Write a protein that holds these residues in place. Structure first.
Motif, PDB file in Angstrom:
ATOM      1  N   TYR A  94     -67.349 -41.367 -20.545  1.00 50.56           N
ATOM      2  CA  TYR A  94     -66.911 -41.917 -21.698  1.00 50.56           C
ATOM      3  C   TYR A  94     -67.910 -41.597 -22.945  1.00 50.56           C
ATOM      4  O   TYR A  94     -68.989 -42.487 -22.745  1.00 50.56           O
ATOM      5  N   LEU A  95     -67.416 -41.065 -23.861  1.00 51.23           N
ATOM      6  CA  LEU A  95     -68.343 -40.900 -25.005  1.00 51.23           C
ATOM      7  C   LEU A  95     -68.174 -42.465 -25.694  1.00 51.23           C
ATOM      8  O   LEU A  95     -67.178 -43.019 -26.113  1.00 51.23           O
ATOM      9  N   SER A  96     -69.264 -43.013 -25.956  1.00 52.69           N
ATOM     10  CA  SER A  96     -69.459 -44.575 -26.011  1.00 52.69           C
ATOM     11  C   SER A  96     -70.789 -44.764 -26.823  1.00 52.69           C
ATOM     12  O   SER A  96     -71.703 -44.467 -26.409  1.00 52.69           O
ATOM     13  N   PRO A  97     -70.195 -45.750 -27.956  1.00 51.67           N
ATOM     14  CA  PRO A  97     -71.571 -46.224 -28.704  1.00 51.67           C
ATOM     15  C   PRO A  97     -72.538 -47.095 -27.807  1.00 51.67           C
ATOM     16  O   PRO A  97     -73.881 -47.137 -28.225  1.00 51.67           O
ATOM     17  N   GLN A  98     -71.943 -47.746 -26.553  1.00 50.84           N
ATOM     18  CA  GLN A  98     -72.794 -48.592 -25.895  1.00 50.84           C
ATOM     19  C   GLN A  98     -73.223 -47.818 -24.629  1.00 50.84           C
ATOM     20  O   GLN A  98     -73.539 -48.349 -23.562  1.00 50.84           O
ATOM     21  N   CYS A 120     -62.461 -39.289 -24.811  1.00 50.64           N
ATOM     22  CA  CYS A 120     -62.669 -39.487 -26.389  1.00 50.64           C
ATOM     23  C   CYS A 120     -62.149 -40.718 -26.891  1.00 50.64           C
ATOM     24  O   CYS A 120     -60.739 -40.546 -26.798  1.00 50.64           O
ATOM     25  N   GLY A 121     -62.649 -41.743 -27.256  1.00 50.21           N
ATOM     26  CA  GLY A 121     -62.029 -42.819 -27.610  1.00 50.21           C
ATOM     27  C   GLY A 121     -61.789 -42.708 -29.194  1.00 50.21           C
ATOM     28  O   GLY A 121     -62.441 -42.297 -30.062  1.00 50.21           O
ATOM     29  N   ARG A 122     -60.566 -43.594 -29.501  1.00 51.83           N
ATOM     30  CA  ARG A 122     -60.222 -43.865 -30.980  1.00 51.83           C
ATOM     31  C   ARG A 122     -60.201 -45.176 -31.103  1.00 51.83           C
ATOM     32  O   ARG A 122     -60.195 -46.002 -30.287  1.00 51.83           O
ATOM     33  N   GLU A 124     -61.009 -48.989 -32.026  1.00 47.49           N
ATOM     34  CA  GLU A 124     -62.167 -49.473 -31.385  1.00 47.49           C
ATOM     35  C   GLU A 124     -62.657 -49.344 -30.252  1.00 47.49           C
ATOM     36  O   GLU A 124     -63.569 -49.922 -29.554  1.00 47.49           O
ATOM     37  N   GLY A 125     -61.883 -48.502 -29.360  1.00 45.91           N
ATOM     38  CA  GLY A 125     -62.130 -48.061 -28.031  1.00 45.91           C
ATOM     39  C   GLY A 125     -61.299 -48.296 -26.939  1.00 45.91           C
ATOM     40  O   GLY A 125     -59.695 -48.334 -27.188  1.00 45.91           O
ATOM     41  N   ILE A 126     -61.748 -48.308 -25.829  1.00 45.95           N
ATOM     42  CA  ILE A 126     -60.988 -48.564 -24.654  1.00 45.95           C
ATOM     43  C   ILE A 126     -61.117 -49.951 -23.967  1.00 45.95           C
ATOM     44  O   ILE A 126     -62.008 -50.424 -24.037  1.00 45.95           O
ATOM     45  N   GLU A 138     -71.147 -43.723 -19.132  1.00 47.89           N
ATOM     46  CA  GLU A 138     -71.075 -43.787 -20.671  1.00 47.89           C
ATOM     47  C   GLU A 138     -72.378 -43.267 -21.258  1.00 47.89           C
ATOM     48  O   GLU A 138     -73.533 -43.423 -20.805  1.00 47.89           O
ATOM     49  N   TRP A 139     -72.172 -42.514 -22.350  1.00 50.67           N
ATOM     50  CA  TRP A 139     -73.105 -41.816 -23.179  1.00 50.67           C
ATOM     51  C   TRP A 139     -72.947 -42.012 -24.700  1.00 50.67           C
ATOM     52  O   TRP A 139     -71.752 -41.738 -25.021  1.00 50.67           O
ATOM     53  N   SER A 140     -74.059 -41.940 -25.282  1.00 56.29           N
ATOM     54  CA  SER A 140     -74.132 -42.007 -26.775  1.00 56.29           C
ATOM     55  C   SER A 140     -74.746 -40.993 -27.578  1.00 56.29           C
ATOM     56  O   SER A 140     -75.963 -40.729 -26.919  1.00 56.29           O
ATOM     57  N   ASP A 143     -77.163 -44.035 -32.593  1.00 56.31           N
ATOM     58  CA  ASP A 143     -76.838 -45.428 -33.169  1.00 56.31           C
ATOM     59  C   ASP A 143     -76.332 -45.370 -34.365  1.00 56.31           C
ATOM     60  O   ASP A 143     -76.890 -46.044 -35.396  1.00 56.31           O
ATOM     61  N   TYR A 144     -75.018 -45.034 -34.577  1.00 58.52           N
ATOM     62  CA  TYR A 144     -74.444 -45.036 -35.874  1.00 58.52           C
ATOM     63  C   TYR A 144     -72.832 -45.362 -35.801  1.00 58.52           C
ATOM     64  O   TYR A 144     -72.323 -44.985 -34.647  1.00 58.52           O
ATOM     65  N   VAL A 145     -72.136 -45.382 -36.707  1.00 56.01           N
ATOM     66  CA  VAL A 145     -70.666 -45.726 -36.512  1.00 56.01           C
ATOM     67  C   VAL A 145     -69.903 -44.856 -36.947  1.00 56.01           C
ATOM     68  O   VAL A 145     -69.618 -44.395 -37.873  1.00 56.01           O
ATOM     69  N   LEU A 146     -69.098 -44.395 -35.873  1.00 58.62           N
ATOM     70  CA  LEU A 146     -68.025 -43.318 -36.347  1.00 58.62           C
ATOM     71  C   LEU A 146     -66.671 -43.780 -35.818  1.00 58.62           C
ATOM     72  O   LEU A 146     -66.460 -44.929 -35.782  1.00 58.62           O
ATOM     73  N   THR A 147     -65.674 -42.663 -36.188  1.00 59.32           N
ATOM     74  CA  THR A 147     -64.219 -43.110 -36.149  1.00 59.32           C
ATOM     75  C   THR A 147     -63.690 -42.719 -34.807  1.00 59.32           C
ATOM     76  O   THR A 147     -62.426 -42.800 -34.607  1.00 59.32           O
ATOM     77  N   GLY A 148     -64.350 -41.822 -33.866  1.00 60.62           N
ATOM     78  CA  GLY A 148     -63.782 -41.091 -33.260  1.00 60.62           C
ATOM     79  C   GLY A 148     -64.742 -40.582 -31.986  1.00 60.62           C
ATOM     80  O   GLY A 148     -66.086 -40.374 -32.304  1.00 60.62           O
ATOM     81  N   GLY A 149     -64.578 -40.321 -30.578  1.00 57.82           N
ATOM     82  CA  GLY A 149     -65.311 -39.965 -29.823  1.00 57.82           C
ATOM     83  C   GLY A 149     -65.490 -38.175 -29.620  1.00 57.82           C
ATOM     84  O   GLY A 149     -66.272 -37.588 -28.637  1.00 57.82           O
ATOM     85  N   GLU A 150     -64.452 -37.702 -30.329  1.00 55.75           N
ATOM     86  CA  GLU A 150     -64.262 -36.213 -30.162  1.00 55.75           C
ATOM     87  C   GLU A 150     -65.771 -35.309 -30.906  1.00 55.75           C
ATOM     88  O   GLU A 150     -66.103 -34.525 -30.159  1.00 55.75           O
TER      89      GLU A 150
ATOM     90  N   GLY B 171     -72.358 -52.943 -36.752  1.00 59.37           N
ATOM     91  CA  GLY B 171     -73.420 -52.271 -36.558  1.00 59.37           C
ATOM     92  C   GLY B 171     -73.944 -52.485 -35.036  1.00 59.37           C
ATOM     93  O   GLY B 171     -74.658 -51.778 -34.253  1.00 59.37           O
ATOM     94  N   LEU B 172     -73.796 -53.696 -34.858  1.00 58.55           N
ATOM     95  CA  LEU B 172     -73.946 -54.320 -33.539  1.00 58.55           C
ATOM     96  C   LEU B 172     -73.178 -53.834 -32.348  1.00 58.55           C
ATOM     97  O   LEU B 172     -72.028 -53.682 -32.760  1.00 58.55           O
ATOM     98  N   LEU B 173     -73.368 -53.678 -31.194  1.00 58.53           N
ATOM     99  CA  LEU B 173     -72.471 -53.193 -29.980  1.00 58.53           C
ATOM    100  C   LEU B 173     -71.350 -54.004 -29.953  1.00 58.53           C
ATOM    101  O   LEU B 173     -71.558 -55.422 -30.044  1.00 58.53           O
TER     102      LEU B 173
HETATM  103  C1  LIG Z   1     -73.309 -48.518 -32.671  1.00 54.66           C
HETATM  104  C2  LIG Z   1     -71.746 -48.871 -32.896  1.00 54.66           C
HETATM  105  C3  LIG Z   1     -71.416 -50.343 -32.756  1.00 54.66           C
HETATM  106  C4  LIG Z   1     -70.107 -50.797 -32.517  1.00 54.66           C
HETATM  107  C5  LIG Z   1     -69.061 -49.551 -32.766  1.00 54.66           C
HETATM  108  C6  LIG Z   1     -69.420 -48.513 -32.978  1.00 54.66           C
HETATM  109  C7  LIG Z   1     -68.472 -47.432 -33.261  1.00 54.66           C
HETATM  110  O1  LIG Z   1     -68.817 -46.140 -34.025  1.00 54.66           O
HETATM  111  N1  LIG Z   1     -67.292 -47.551 -32.757  1.00 54.66           N
HETATM  112  C8  LIG Z   1     -66.054 -46.416 -33.019  1.00 54.66           C
HETATM  113  C9  LIG Z   1     -65.961 -45.597 -31.791  1.00 54.66           C
HETATM  114  N2  LIG Z   1     -67.508 -44.807 -31.853  1.00 54.66           N
HETATM  115  C10 LIG Z   1     -67.835 -43.920 -31.000  1.00 54.66           C
HETATM  116  O2  LIG Z   1     -67.146 -43.511 -29.951  1.00 54.66           O
HETATM  117  C11 LIG Z   1     -69.089 -43.357 -30.775  1.00 54.66           C
HETATM  118  C12 LIG Z   1     -70.014 -43.749 -32.131  1.00 54.66           C
HETATM  119  C13 LIG Z   1     -71.380 -43.206 -32.168  1.00 54.66           C
HETATM  120  C14 LIG Z   1     -71.711 -42.502 -31.260  1.00 54.66           C
HETATM  121  C15 LIG Z   1     -71.113 -41.942 -30.100  1.00 54.66           C
HETATM  122  N3  LIG Z   1     -71.271 -41.403 -29.035  1.00 54.66           N
HETATM  123  O3  LIG Z   1     -70.243 -41.196 -28.355  1.00 54.66           O
HETATM  124  C16 LIG Z   1     -69.321 -41.829 -28.793  1.00 54.66           C
HETATM  125  C17 LIG Z   1     -69.762 -42.430 -29.927  1.00 54.66           C
HETATM  126  C18 LIG Z   1     -65.675 -46.120 -30.580  1.00 54.66           C
HETATM  127  C19 LIG Z   1     -64.661 -45.496 -29.788  1.00 54.66           C
HETATM  128  C20 LIG Z   1     -63.859 -44.934 -30.964  1.00 54.66           C
HETATM  129  C21 LIG Z   1     -64.964 -44.544 -32.100  1.00 54.66           C
HETATM  130  C22 LIG Z   1     -71.074 -47.978 -33.023  1.00 54.66           C
END
Ligand SMILES: Cc1cccc(C(=O)NCC2(NC(=O)c3cccc4nocc34)CCCC2)c1
Ligand SMILES: Cc1cccc(C(=O)NCC2(NC(=O)c3cccc4nocc34)CCCC2)c1
Lengths: 242, 242
Positions: A94-98, A120-122, A124-126, A138-140, A143-150, B171-173
């Motif tokens: 699972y592509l995941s921020p955590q 790939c999550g869209r 807020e996730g799964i 789970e892999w990241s 450390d930054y915020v995206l809108t998808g795991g694609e 920004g936090l998990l």
């Molecule tokens: C630091 C932080 C804290 C809380 C939320 C988010 C955030 O970006 N949440 C949004 C989603 N982010 C990712 O999937 C995603 C984002 C970044 C790198 C990644 N590497 O793999 C998947 C990744 C979660 C599922 C849908 C998109 C990020």
């Protein structure tokens, strides 16, 4: 065929936007790996696993709020279909921020798998329970915020594709690169690179790589026992720098 | 129009593979930001800036070796054309493995620019002197080896697009997420989320977010002065965990 059968890499992808993955299956190195059957990328869309008229793929979280989640049933069923296609031995990621931070060491691990399934999550996730029941790791990518795991998923694919036998064809930061012209807006190429003395060039490039790694990513040196030449050149660069 | 003029974001892209960027201009949030004219992505291909019959965009490095580089002239001229289209105030960023590590703080900085020019490297990268003459900042999405800068560039775009006024719409998990069904393969939702006590739910979600951040990305807490409630909840979670 020079490449043995069973060394090709298969990557199943679960995504609400399969067409995004044309970015890696139709261009560059990965595009050529796909065209030469060294890499196979197969996508499943949770939208095809719905049963309501409007193919709903999001759901509301228990506890309320604006934070939508992926609907469990279509996502879970897509994963199960991918597992079935893969057969035994497929690792589900699972592509995941955590998730665990992806680095080249981590890439090397993942590339040892002939079969991968990327989820790939869209939104807020799964659902958290899907991670326990369906996800292996789970892999990241950062450390930054995206809108998808694609995009992270395609990044992972791009990085592991380099390990596929038949593709092209050491993790430290590169030395400064120089190509034509000899003088670019007044800036000249280091004379050693013009010299034709390839033993001098070899030492210079190695030294510049070590120094730049030391200055910009010193953490990369913390997991390595450097060679005698590398330690000698690095010590020189450190003394000269200060 | 609810959104004021001049708040839209313009992103120029230099890449040998422009069609890859359909992955962000035609799908998801960024696709909708483009469709609603909140985000504009304009690509220039160095291949269109060549003058030889075969449109050569790579060159050999001074000092020899198999490590090909991007040809300076077509790349430089593409950047100049992008600069001209952007006008004044455009920040030129090179997606680079030796750049400053991208984090959410870094994203916040970059998102303050109404105009960005992103340069995507192929092969072993670009001439060092081009960085001095054309590039303002270098950025990296992670410490791992890729085959191109397009995917990191699209990652950057995806992250900064969230800051565009008119888009959606800390920004936090995240805390663990739960959606239907109530019981998933025997696994139940935490009762507090089913309770309907939203003040209890608020405290729980915040606590779980702090604990998970502490356990998986403790570095993210090192740059924050937490609120009194957050410090109280985190201390509780730490004591309960051990
Ligand atoms: C630091 C932080 C804290 C809380 C939320 C988010 C955030 O970006 N949440 C949004 C989603 N982010 C990712 O999937 C995603 C984002 C970044 C790198 C990644 N590497 O793999 C998947 C990744 C979660 C599922 C849908 C998109 C990020
Ligand atoms: C750790 C390490 C050391 C030496 C080389 C490389 C490497 O991957 N070199 C290949 C290229 N990598 C990237 O552009 C690139 C890669 C990764 C993250 C990025 N974030 O932005 C751009 C990125 C260089 C230009 C063409 C592709 C990586």
């Amino acid at each position: 065929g020079l490449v043995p059968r069973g060394s090709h890499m298969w990557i199943g992808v679960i995504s609400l936007f399969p067409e995004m993955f044309k970015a890696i299956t139709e261009f560059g190195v990965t595009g050529r790996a796909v065209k030469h059957n060294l890499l196979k990328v197969e996508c499943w869309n949770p939208r095809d696993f719905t049963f309501d008229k409007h193919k709903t793929v999001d759901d509301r979280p228990y506890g309320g709020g604006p934070g939508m989640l992926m609907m469990v049933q279509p996502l879970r069923d897509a994963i199960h279909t991918a597992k079935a296609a893969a057969g035994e031995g497929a690792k589900v990621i699972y592509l995941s921020p955590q998730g665990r931070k992806l680095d080249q060491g981590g890439v090397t691990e993942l590339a040892q798998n002939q079969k991968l399934i990327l989820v790939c999550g869209r939104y807020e996730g799964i659902d958290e329970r899907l991670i326990q029941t369906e996800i292996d790791e789970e892999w990241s990518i950062g450390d930054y915020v995206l809108t998808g795991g694609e995009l992270p998923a395609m990044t992972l694919i791009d990085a592991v594709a380099r390990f596929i036998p038949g593709v092209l064809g050491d993790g430290l930061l590169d030395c400064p690169h120089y190509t034509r012209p000899e003088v670019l807006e007044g800036l000249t190429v280091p004379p050693v690179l013009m010299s034709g003395h390839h033993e001098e060039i070899r030492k210079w490039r190695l030294k510049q790589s070590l120094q730049r790694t030391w200055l910009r990513r010193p953490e990369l040196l913390e997991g390595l026992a450097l060679t005698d030449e590398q330690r000698k050149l690095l010590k020189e660069a450190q003394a000269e720098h200060n």
